[PDB]
Amino acid sequence: THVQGRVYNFLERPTGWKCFVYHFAVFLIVLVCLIFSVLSTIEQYAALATGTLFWMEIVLVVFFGTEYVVRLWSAGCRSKYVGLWGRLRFARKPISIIDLIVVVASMVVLCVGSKATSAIRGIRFLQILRMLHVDRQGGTWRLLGSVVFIHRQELITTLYIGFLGLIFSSYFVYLAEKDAVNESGRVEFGSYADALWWGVVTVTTIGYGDKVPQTWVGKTIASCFSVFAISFFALPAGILGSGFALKVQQKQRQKHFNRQIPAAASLIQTAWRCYAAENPDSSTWKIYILREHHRATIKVIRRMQYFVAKKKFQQARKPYDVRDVIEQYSQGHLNLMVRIKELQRRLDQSIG
Amino acid sequence: THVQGRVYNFLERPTGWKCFVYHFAVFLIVLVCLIFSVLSTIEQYAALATGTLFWMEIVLVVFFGTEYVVRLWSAGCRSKYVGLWGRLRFARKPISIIDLIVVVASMVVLCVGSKATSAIRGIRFLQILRMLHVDRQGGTWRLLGSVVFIHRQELITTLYIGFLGLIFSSYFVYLAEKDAVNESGRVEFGSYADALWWGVVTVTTIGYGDKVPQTWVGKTIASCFSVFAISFFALPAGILGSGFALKVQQKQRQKHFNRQIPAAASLIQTAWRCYAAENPDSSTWKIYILREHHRATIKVIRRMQYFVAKKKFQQARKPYDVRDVIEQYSQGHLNLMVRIKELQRRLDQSIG
Amino acid sequence: THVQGRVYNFLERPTGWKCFVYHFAVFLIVLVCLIFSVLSTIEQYAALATGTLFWMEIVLVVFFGTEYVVRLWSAGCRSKYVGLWGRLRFARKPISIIDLIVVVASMVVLCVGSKATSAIRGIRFLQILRMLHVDRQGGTWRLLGSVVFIHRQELITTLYIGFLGLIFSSYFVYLAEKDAVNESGRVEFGSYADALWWGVVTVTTIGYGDKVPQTWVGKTIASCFSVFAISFFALPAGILGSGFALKVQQKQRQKHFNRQIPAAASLIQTAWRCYAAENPDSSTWKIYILREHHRATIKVIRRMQYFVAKKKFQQARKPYDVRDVIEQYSQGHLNLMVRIKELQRRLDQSIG
Amino acid sequence: THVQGRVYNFLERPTGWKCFVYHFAVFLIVLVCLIFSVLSTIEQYAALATGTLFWMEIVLVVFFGTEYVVRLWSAGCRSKYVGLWGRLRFARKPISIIDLIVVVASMVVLCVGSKATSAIRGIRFLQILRMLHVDRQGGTWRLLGSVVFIHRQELITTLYIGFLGLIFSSYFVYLAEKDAVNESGRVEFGSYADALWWGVVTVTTIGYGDKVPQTWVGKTIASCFSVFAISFFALPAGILGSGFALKVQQKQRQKHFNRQIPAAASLIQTAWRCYAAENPDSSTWKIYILREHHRATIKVIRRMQYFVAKKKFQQARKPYDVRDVIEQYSQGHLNLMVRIKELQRRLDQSIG
Amino acid sequence: TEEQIAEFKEAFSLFDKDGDGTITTKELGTVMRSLGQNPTEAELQDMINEVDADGNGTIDFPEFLTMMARKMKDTDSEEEIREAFRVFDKDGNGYISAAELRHVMTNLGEKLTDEEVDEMIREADIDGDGQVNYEEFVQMMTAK
Amino acid sequence: TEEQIAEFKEAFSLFDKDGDGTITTKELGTVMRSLGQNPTEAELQDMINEVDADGNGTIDFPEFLTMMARKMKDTDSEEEIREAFRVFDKDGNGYISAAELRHVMTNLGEKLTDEEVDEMIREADIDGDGQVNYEEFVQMMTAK
Amino acid sequence: TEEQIAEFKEAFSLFDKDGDGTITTKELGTVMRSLGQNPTEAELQDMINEVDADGNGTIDFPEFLTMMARKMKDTDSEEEIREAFRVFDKDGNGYISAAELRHVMTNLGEKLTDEEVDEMIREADIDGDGQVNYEEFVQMMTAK
Amino acid sequence: TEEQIAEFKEAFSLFDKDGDGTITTKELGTVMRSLGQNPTEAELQDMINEVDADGNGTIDFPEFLTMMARKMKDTDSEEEIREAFRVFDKDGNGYISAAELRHVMTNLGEKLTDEEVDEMIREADIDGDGQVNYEEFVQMMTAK
Ligand SMILES: [Ca+2]
Ligand SMILES: [Ca+2]
Ligand SMILES: [Ca+2]
Ligand SMILES: [Ca+2]
Ligand SMILES: [Ca+2]
Ligand SMILES: [Ca+2]
Ligand SMILES: [Ca+2]
Ligand SMILES: [Ca+2]
């Protein structure tokens, strides 16, 4: 149980330099095996890079089959995944489904293609699909998905107006250019699909130059469209790029980790004390020292204490903000004003 | 009146998944009908995609005519649009004018072109113009227009200097290249309009490569212009992109909705009490307990209370800021310093 | 003197809609006259657009000569520019030098070319140079120059590393490609200046496609260079674009204009009272009620009061900041702690 | 020793205008010598620009050899570099290794090539490598490396997903286009390396247009890939550009330099007083006025005072933050509440 | 406007009560306490900071006349009151309930006398299902 | 729910003790001091600001019934308690030590009676190396 | 500068009044109260924080001499006073009214003696329509 | 480390003085006042917040042993003291004057006894033009 958690921390949540050496070695062997998948299509190298890719794929199907079995066994140190239904819960998460598909399709291709051209056609796509293996616990995809979801209203706005300008401008250039002839003798903008391929290439600033408008009406519309409606496709890089940079700035004003230890302890035990109220024989009533009406009013006060503790645990996990300054000045000024009332009442009591 | 508001919330301010299923189905049928408007220009498919576009347009003119009539009737649940002049107010807003133009021009084209080539030329532009129908209540255009208006001084600055660099640099490349001959035998930069089309294509980083400068003077000017004056056209994506991201960051420090309920109640009733002052027989004078000079001074104090309540209602709608901390410390320190003055005066009263 | 300031506010600091109508009309006539400068180079239109550009330039040299004389006279409402040396100060500012050069070179060209081809060659550049006239008081150039100057360390960093990657990568592609032949039979990368023109076109993402590397070594170096060192030329749009957006955000937390009126009054009169100290016969000594040693100590206290008033006037012009909260809590807590000391001392005085 | 520090401040940490004139003159002579390295490859100028580059390199190897010797001697004003092992420490820093390599390889090439074509091949790369000399103390590279390191999680995220979209999309376009023929008769996408060169050129928005997909399946995949996966390569300019702009904004809310002088003095002398505790004969014990148990408790209190002084010195170097407001309100409210307790206890002492 | 500034100088003299020409927070507090109101110190300071434009902390007479000049029947002020009703509006259609408006006017914020709310409700057509069009109120109390 | 609102009106009357229909901080403070609790003034204010939705500062009866309606066995509340245990979890596997949980429950935050913690520990299977699966606690105290 | 530092040591001794070499807020407060000024505690603290550069809170003698060294006739200080007049300037042309300047100098901020303002006005050419060129003042009081 | 934890339990008992195992701000304040120190309340709170990791506000014994474990001769702590000397360093070469260091150590911050500074100066080679290499001090007081 100790060594089980030790190898789970080596494979699944890696840290240090020994974990870095292992995962860098795995990333290099899958990238070298992709380079041989590139060289298998060049006619000079197609004989060599197939005879060294059939043997390299047998080593990697044994290696990643062994690593998947070790990782599936070693996922039992977590309390989520212990038991047979817990292992089936570990095989349900999406990176393990990708890893299982890669290893079992490699066995199918190497057993069917052992005794072959379409087997190579199936190898090359698995060589590509094995690149998803290096990002281990999905932190890359969760960081991107978090920033795309917060900024979803702005990304839908710029994609909608950019698409809308694409459709209207490609139609106006199709009308202005549908009779023009190229210098080679052919017709550039034959259909409306050709002008729409022009519009996609122009609005994203690629400009292959295979389709260029010829008449001065098409050049005038393309000049106004290219000046204005290109910014609506360069905006998602600006929105997400500044969204990442503001999130990194906000991570430096974090609260220190000890400031949530009393709030987390208080959340656990106010929630338990709300649970222990519904048993009338519990020893949780012995704090409040017969008890007919007091059962109900203790349950109301305990529910209020749970809601306050839940709010203060949520506030102890956020970064510092102006809301914290206004909240603690409200508490401090209220305690101090009550204290001057106490001094006032005692001065009026004794002297009068 | 109940079902009228229920279908207005289904069509006009949609939310949930049932509303999402309806508007996604409408967006798919208008996009599929656009794809047949694309295929009607390809010579292989021009016979098929016209015989299935005349029938698809009759279904959609009946469908969007019915939806416009239902939406126009169902706009009467709002108090703005009740009555015949209220319905005419609902037909004046710009998305309903677009929807009316689409449905009545579809009826005109399908009745004129029923008994036809220029009818197809009129169908295709309405197929495109029907794409404005999916963004229902204009939140896309109002979000873009709000950020463009706040940043208007910076967008005019970068567009002006980018245009100014375009004009000067395209003239200097026209002077350096007006005698050069292409390898094909023709002359690239014949007029100053050709060099200005070169400048538009270069400064927005498209680069079709149809017009490239040949002499070394034109290549030197194009190198300095392309390094510096391209950033002045990549700046509106940077200004608006960071403007959207700072607005999204500011939406997370909103005040909670209950903190403006007493301020909104206080604005309504201080404004009514200012209104009820000008009737001398009102029962609003009975709070202030004969009344010759007191009429004027009550009206002054009530006008001051209205102005204070209007300020505090504006402050309860903004996010938190450093101005709030300075304002509540000023109020708290002033109350506490008056309280120490009160304790001081009573101590000097009794003892001396 | 009243009408002089009224026309200076119309021409020099414009506002409203009447000022907008005037300056929009001037911008349209200078842009229409630029369009005829474009059409004078097309061979079909060179006869028409010269016979209507000689007459259009006489109207505009009379019009802008009259506007320059009216503006130079009407600059005397300001106290800076009153007098003959003040008018010469008004003709020294850079937008008036541009306006004077345009009108006097138009007179020289229209008098020399009256009785002509090189005159047209001189007209076209003045048609372009007259575009600097629309931005009246330089707010466009001062806004850009302010943001470029604050971010100067970052712009020099990205321009230096982008230039450095340009030089090294263009040399390595020159070595890998200096013997390759194009499919047309010619040699693309003949010298190191050809590979450096390739590098400029690639690193700014234009890509004309006239010069593309052929060998696989040149394609490998161009792939690594184009992935990494292109971001160092797309960074000045990112730095300046987010610099403009953060400046616009900071303009909404401005202090209200009345909060600097007592600080500006206090700066003026503490500075005058420091000036009035050095005359021993002044009536400024009569506040301090013989006077041998007190002359020096009053001058020290008045110099300290001037420095405090100058600091508080600088603080009343900045937006709100966390420094303001810490500063006013220091003042408030110090006054309140002295007040509790006062109550303590009087309680120990009377009772003991 | 005085003149040694005076020339070290002239060469190594330059400031003013005299230092600017010197380093601008050095940057111009190394750039002019690079321009002659460009002209030595053009066939018209290869005879002239070699006969003036052999003599220009002898002047520059004498000049930069002399400057390296002067700078190495003059580095002894610092206390880090005094002594022979200190000079060897000065020759270990990376900009001095670059400068030593340039001057000693220039001597090797000019002595071997004195009595020559491959010598010119070695001169040109040193002409390029001498451009690293202008950025003197590495502030350019340290500013870039600081912002790249803070934003490392986001840059690895966008580079990983951009590379992953590159590989999958280039494979799908290779499948759709591997049989298509160009209009010139050749085959564009012959191997998978050709489609991967297409993908690199497209995803970074260069678009040379040498390789354009022909079939409609390749055009459909290229349209979806070019709309979406191009933003993942325009994101590192957005992340770093907004990272630089937020760092510049944070530099304006710096604490003033006098607010860390008492904290730096207190750090030095609490750390020394912790050091002086372990000598029992020291005079640091004479503050605490026999001493059996008091030795241990003084060492505990002195270690606590050192940790508090180290925290307050770290806080005096950061910009202002909301954490400072919450920290000083906690201190101020705690002192004031203790003071009201003191007044309460004395009032209950005397009167009761 | 000469009868207007005669009335405004007349009303300013009831607050001044000497020849200063300025109004202090104390000098306004005695007038409100003579009506039986008892305001707080920060309430009086919030009233005076909405009137002055010099920042000194007292209300001079041109500041008093600037307050009495500017009009309640405004472009912006109508929209503020219309936005204030929409907080208490469920489904946002432009109608609030009668007993909901009575519960808001007599409990939240400055608590109104019940006879005032009985006048306020009957100023508008209240029947028709118990709904009341609050834009009728906004046109009414900005008719001035 | 008529027996529920009968019990909730019954429980509301123990705090009100007159015919207001609102609960003040004083009016709650006397109930807690009658149980021998002695809360602070800001503690009572923090309790009442988590219940009202009108901002006025007292708990009306629909606000009281809204508090008693909403359920502890929630989607979010289960995740809050599960996230609260992970602070005290070394290596994050889903197990905390028995003596570590006793040290946390009797010292940090609101200090528990030792008989309560002796009940809390034996509610879960504590053996097996001294480790306890805290997700068994989270399912237990959100079974309600 | 030896006569200057003789005068500056002479002036420093009037504040010190013992052999410390430092000036405390109390030690400056007695000098200002001996002139009949009555400053606040935060006023004395604001005076001393503009002089020291060590942060300890007292004015040593090199800090005192650094204050007396630096010149009022400055590049920046002229622009601060010129920017301070433009607050009170309508239409921004460089002229303010005579009675407007008398109303500002005798009411706002530190209130001036009326004989001082009667001197201040007649230092500049006041006639010509009642306008006064305030840049004549800025050149005057920065002529030093 | 058993002799070390014997000494650390011995030193912890001098602060505890009962069987709590925790140290309060009062419980530390009596020890410092018995040495004749007179600290402020916020000084005692700043001392204790640098020791605990539980946030409760008292120093338990493992927190006390964690404070006494971690080493002054550190990678970071050497750089903090080296950065603290550079504030008092003109031209930044690595040398400060002897009388400048005596002026800083006896006036700024916690004021040192003059006999301590006379020891501190003679710990380093002070001659050679009056300059002293402060990195010799940093190596000295981090030799521990
Ligand atoms: Ca008065
Ligand atoms: Ca005023
Ligand atoms: Ca009640
Ligand atoms: Ca309530
Ligand atoms: Ca002294
Ligand atoms: Ca000092
Ligand atoms: Ca204890
Ligand atoms: Ca602790």
Same domain, A10 and A122: yes
- CB contact under 8 Å between C262 and E53, yes or no, is no
Q: How far is Cα C266 from Cα A285, in angstroms, rounded to an integer?
A: 67
Q: How far is Cα A202 from Cα A215, in angstroms, rounded to an integer?
A: 17
Task: Say if residues G58 and C351 touch (Cβ distance below 8 Å).
Answer: no
Token pair in block for residue A254: 């974090």
Same domain, D196 and D174: yes
Q: How far is Cα A242 from Cα B244, in angstroms, rounded to an integer?
A: 9
**Sign (positive or negative) of CA dihedral E12, E16, E18, E19:** negative
Return the residue in H106, H107, H111, H112 with the most chain G beta carbons within 10 A, the one to mutate for interface testing.
Answer: H107
Touching, A vs G (3+ Cβ pairs under 8 A): no
- Neighbouring chains of F at 3+ CB pairs under 8 Å are A, B, E, H
C-alpha E9 chain-centroid distance: 21
Looking at A198, A216, A250, the residue that finishes a domain is A250
Token pair in block for residue E41: 């110190």
- CB contact under 8 Å between A340 and B336, yes or no, is yes
Same domain, C85 and C6: yes
Decide if C146 is inside a domain.
no
Token pair in block for residue F70: 């909403």
Instruction: Give resolution in angstroms.
Output: 3.1
Cα distances (Å, whole numbers) of residue G113 to C288, C309, G99, G117: 11, 18, 15, 7
Cα dihedral B244→B249→B250→B254 (10° resolution) = 130
Which residues lie across from E96 on neighbouring strands?
Answer: E132
Give the Å distance between the CA of G9 and the centre of ligand 6: 17
Same domain, D157 and D238: yes
Task: Say if residues C58 and C114 touch (Cβ distance below 8 Å).
Answer: no
Q: Using CA coordinates, name the residue in chain C closest to E52.
A: C258
Task: Say if residues H17 and H27 touch (Cβ distance below 8 Å).
Answer: yes
Q: How far is Cα C144 from Cα D229, in angstroms, rounded to an integer?
A: 32
| Local structure of residue D256 (DSSP, 8 states) | P
Instruction: Name every chain D residue with its beta carbon within 8 A of the beta carbon of B216.
Output: none
Same domain, A265 and A302: yes
Spatial neighbors of D5 by CB under 8 A, at least 6 apart, are D77, H91, H93
Spatial neighbors of H59 by CB under 8 A, at least 6 apart, are H22, H23, H48, H51, H52, H67
Q: Is H24 annotated as a binding residue?
A: no
Cα distances (Å, whole numbers) of residue A318 to A72, A246, A250, A261, F92: 35, 15, 10, 14, 21
Residue H109 contacts D, CB cutoff 8 Å: yes
- DSSP helix/strand/coil, F97: strand
Same domain, D246 and D258: no
Of B239, B265, B254, the C-alpha closest to B319 is B254
| Ion ligand 3: residue ranges with CB closer than 5 A | F 20, 22
Instruction: Name every chain G residue with its beta carbon within 8 A of the beta carbon of E54.
Output: 107-108
Burial, E13: exposed, middle or buried (Cβ in 10 Å; 0-12, 13-18, 19+)? middle
Q: Using CA coordinates, name the residue in chain F closest to A287.
A: F113
Residue B186, by phi and psi: left (phi above 0), alpha (psi -120 to 50) or beta? beta
**Beta G95-97 vs G131-133: how paired, if at all?**
antiparallel
Touching, H vs B (3+ Cβ pairs under 8 A): no
- For residue B172, the domain's CATH number is 1.10.287.70
Give the Å distance between the CA of F33 and the centre of ligand 3: 17
- What is the number of CB-based contacts under 8 A between chain B and chain D? 12
Cα distances (Å, whole numbers) of residue C176 to B28, C167, C179, C222, E33: 52, 15, 8, 11, 93
Q: How far is Cα G5 from Cα B108, in angstroms, rounded to an integer?
A: 98
C-alpha D348 chain-centroid distance: 64
CB-nearest to C332 from B167, B206, B329 is: B329
Same domain, A181 and A124: no
The range of the structural domain enclosing residue H64 comes to 1-69
Token pair in block for residue C33: 């006259």
- In A139-260, where does DSSP find H-type helix? 139-150, 152-177, 192-203, 216-228, 231-250
CB-nearest to C286 from G87, G115, G133 is: G115
Which residues lie across from E97 on neighbouring strands?
Answer: E131
Q: Which one of the ligands is nearest to E26 CA? A: 1
Looking at A113, A137, A161, the residue that finishes a domain is A137
| Ion ligand 6: residue ranges with CB closer than 5 A | G 52, 54, 56
Cα distances (Å, whole numbers) of residue H60 to D350, F106, H19, H31, H51: 38, 14, 12, 17, 9
Q: How far is Cα G86 from Cα G79, in angstroms, rounded to an integer?
A: 11
- Neighbouring chains of D at 3+ CB pairs under 8 Å are A, B, C, G, H
Give the Å distance between the CA of F128 and the centre of ligand 1: 83
Q: How far is Cα C273 from Cα C253, in angstroms, rounded to an integer?
A: 34
First to last CA, chain G: 18
Task: Say if residues C52 and C36 touch (Cβ distance below 8 Å).
Answer: yes
Same domain, A234 and A246: yes
Decide if B20 is inside a domain.
yes
Residue A326, min C-alpha distance to chain D (Å): 10
Q: How far is Cα C277 from Cα G144, in angstroms, rounded to an integer?
A: 10
Instruction: Indicate the helix (H) or strand (E) that contains E133.
Output: strand E131-133
Q: How far is Cα F38 from Cα F58, in angstroms, rounded to an integer?
A: 20
Q: Which amino acid is at D200?
A: V
- At F97, give phi and psi (nearest 5°): -75, 155
Q: Which amino acid is at D173?
A: V
Same domain, A259 and A316: yes
Instruction: Indicate the helix (H) or strand (E) that contains F4.
Output: helix F2-16
Residue G27 contacts D, CB cutoff 8 Å: no
Residue E63 contacts C, CB cutoff 8 Å: no
Residue with tokens 């032949």: C181
**Sign (positive or negative) of CA dihedral E50, E54, E57, E62:** negative
Looking at D250, D269, D289, the residue that finishes a domain is D250
Which residues lie across from F131 on neighbouring strands?
Answer: F97
Q: What angle do CA E51, E53, E56 make, to 5 degrees?
A: 95
Q: Which amino acid is at C31?
A: L
Same domain, C100 and C11: yes
Give the Å distance between the CA of C321 and the centre of ligand 6: 26
Give the Å distance between the CA of E48 and the centre of ligand 5: 43
Q: Using CA coordinates, name the residue in chain C closest to E57.
A: C262
- CB contact under 8 Å between D240 and C241, yes or no, is no
- For residue G38, the domain's CATH number is 1.10.238.10
Q: Which amino acid is at C219?
A: K
Q: How far is Cα G13 from Cα A100, in angstroms, rounded to an integer?
A: 88
CB-nearest to B300 from E11, E109, E141 is: E11
Q: How many domains is chain A partitioned into structurally?
A: 3
Residue with tokens 């003698």: G61
Residue E60 contacts C, CB cutoff 8 Å: no
Rounded (10°) angle between helices C294-315 and G61-69: 80
Q: How was this structure determined?
A: cryo-EM
Same domain, C223 and C271: no
Q: Which residues of H8-33 are buried (b: 16+ CB within 10 A; e: fewer)?
A: beebbeebbeeeeebbbbebbbebbe
Task: Say if residues B251 and B143 touch (Cβ distance below 8 Å).
Answer: no
Q: How far is Cα H84 from Cα D266, in angstroms, rounded to an integer?
A: 9
Instruction: Name every chain E residue with its beta carbon within 8 A of the beta carbon of G109.
Output: 56
The range of the structural domain enclosing residue D207 comes to 152-250
Instruction: Name every chain B residue with its beta carbon within 8 A of the beta carbon of C124.
Output: 171, 192
Spatial neighbors of B182 by CB under 8 A, at least 6 apart, are B188, B214
- CB contact under 8 Å between B209 and D205, yes or no, is no
Q: How far is Cα A178 from Cα C48, in angstroms, rounded to an integer?
A: 30
Give the Å distance between the CA of B265 and the centre of ligand 4: 13
Give the Å distance between the CA of F26 and the centre of ligand 3: 9
- For residue C91, the domain's CATH number is 1.20.120
